[PDB]
Amino acid sequence: PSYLKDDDGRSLILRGFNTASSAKSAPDGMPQFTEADLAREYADMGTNFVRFLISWRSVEPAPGVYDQQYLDRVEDRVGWYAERGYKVMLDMHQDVYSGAITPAIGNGAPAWATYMDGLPVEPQPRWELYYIQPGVMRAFDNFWNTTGKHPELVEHYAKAWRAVADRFADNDAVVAYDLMNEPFGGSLQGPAFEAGPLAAMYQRTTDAIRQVDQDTWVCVAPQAIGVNQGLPSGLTKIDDPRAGQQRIAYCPHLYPLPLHEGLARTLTDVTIDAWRANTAHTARVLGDVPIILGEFGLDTTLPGARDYIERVYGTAREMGAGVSYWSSDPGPWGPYLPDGTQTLLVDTLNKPYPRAVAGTPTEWSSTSDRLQLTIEPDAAITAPTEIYLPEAGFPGDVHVEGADVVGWDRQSRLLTVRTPADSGNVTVTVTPAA
């Protein structure tokens, strides 16, 4: 596997949340999420990544006019993450195109960009079913210019991304731009969509972003319907005009149809197998790119939930993939119920992991009181390997074999170690002091 790298050249293992669905409907475009909430997340789980929801409606409230005050608010939030050592992926999020699909249900595009052409959008028993209503299908068909009537929409979209990238190009905490949440092709589905207008939009948007930001990873998703459930993607390679090596990453989601016992469990397990094979294939097509699992999640109160969650994280680890769990929002899917009570997720996610490795991590494992990591060395890297250790399992000092301890910060929970680069692959083993 391939990895995103920090400015020190260290390979990043990214663990965090989507933050947050509450931003979708907020007049000011911000999530119901405070700096204190982030402090809690970090204290409880030691996360180092966020998929932070932004929106086209908030960036470009009128055609060609970008809201710099909205971008100020996003920058403020990114600052909270920066202060606690997080890396940020900005997600241009939509579901069912826009809030403008009914006089609420959807989110994303501004009203001026929403052309349903008077076609109906009748109430449906599940939010996902709004995708196939005539007005929503038309809204997307117009956006992709399948209708031939709105070539301007993708152009506006690309330049709205350019505006965001112009603001965040020199932001040390931002590592990735996730160009579109769950692309939906309307009347176009499969390879016709993904290799056609979807790829074309990604290319135009990448090109626009690269007018103002040369180093942030541009993250592209397959179409969500089908691919979320373990079907292959027909997405094609996107060219990165930046000088030097490509910085494109692949950011699919994982949502098995059964969702965890009986035949449902078997179906979900083979879904993971299928999803892994397809994800690896498309990551190769795109240029042997890094993978970020941009969303997965479920109601943690379902029997078998922990086993599913642990299997997904094991699979991500084996694939060298980042993970942003859906989502930090209050409720049984998330780490906290509305009153602040921890769900099963906190203890499940709160495990040691390498955050930033001085070399390629070839394999690693962890339990509550042990971490082992093997590193393919890189003599050019001078920064130490940086590792999270939860206080539950590591209440005092550390015992490290295979590396020299550089620092052990018992407050931030960050262990830093140093390994040789001229001795082949190095295995580091971390256990609690006796």
Ligand SMILES: OC[C@@H]1[C@@H](O[C@@H]2O[C@H](CO)[C@@H](O)[C@H](O)[C@H]2O)[C@H](O)[C@@H](O)c2nccn21
């Ligand atoms: O349904 C859970 C999530 C979904 O959030 C869901 O979006 C819906 C529509 O905005 C909201 O009503 C829900 O409150 C929210 O949890 C993600 O926006 C989407 O990318 C996805 N794909 C699969 C699952 N999910």
Ligand code: NA
């Ligand atoms: Na409109």
Ligand code: NA
């Ligand atoms: Na950056």
